């Protein structure tokens, strides 16, 4: 049909999402920035931008040929990027498989003509947007650790008053 704004990402188990939003509400007032909805919390692997249906099929076939074992993410880091005006969660030492997976999807995107910045992959989970002022960043909560078993292609849209990330396809990682 019509083109969509697409990105590949890793999702978070519902319980960890709940812990994150509780932690965020505890540590950041509304004025700190605009909260990412619980269901929209994710770790982007590759951003594709606007993509026709034909190109989406092509990239989906490429993603489907990726053979990457699963890995575990332990979110032990938080920070703020003032240039992007985001507050994020992350991993001090991401597993090699995460980097490998993101690098493959980014290369596939770039080869298809998708704008990739030459910027190095910086894995993160955005918690607050429009965080234009420096705020104290506490460490994340305890034991936000989980096994990643798959990755997903999402469509991004703004409908009503809300950002919506819609899952289109998923691919298991080898476990
Ligand atoms: O506050 P600050 O002065 O630390 O902000 P900042 O200077 O933009 O952030 C510093 C570090 O975070 C990375 N970074 C910043 N914004 C990013 C984004 N939107 N996506 C991915 N990586 C990002 C930068 O890598 P790059 O600037 O090399 O991407 C740089 O290594
Ligand atoms: N009033 C309005 O009309 C309005 C207002 C706001 C948003 N919107 C729309 O609603 C959606 C919200 O946008 P969004 O910012 O929530 O999501 P988005 O712009 O669709 O991006 C989705 C994900 O891709 C990442 N990303 C974007 N460019 C990238 C790049 N060059 N390299 C690596 N990663 C990249 C973002 O990273 P980060 O997580 O680091 O940002 C984000 O996690 C968009 O479709 C936007 O057009 C509309
Ligand atoms: Cl959101």
Numbering used by the authors: 2 to 176
From the paper:
The adenosine 2′,5′-bisphosphate moiety in each monomer binds identically, however, and in a mode highly similar to that seen in 2′-AMP. The 5′-phosphate mimics the next phosphodiester in an RNA molecule, and it can be used to deduce further binding determinants for RNA substrates. The orientation of the reaction products 2′-AMP and NADP+ in the active site indicates the direction, into which an RNA molecule would continue, considering the last residue sits in the active site.
The 2H phosphoesterase superfamily is an ancient group of proteins and protein domains characterized by a common fold and a few conserved active site residues.
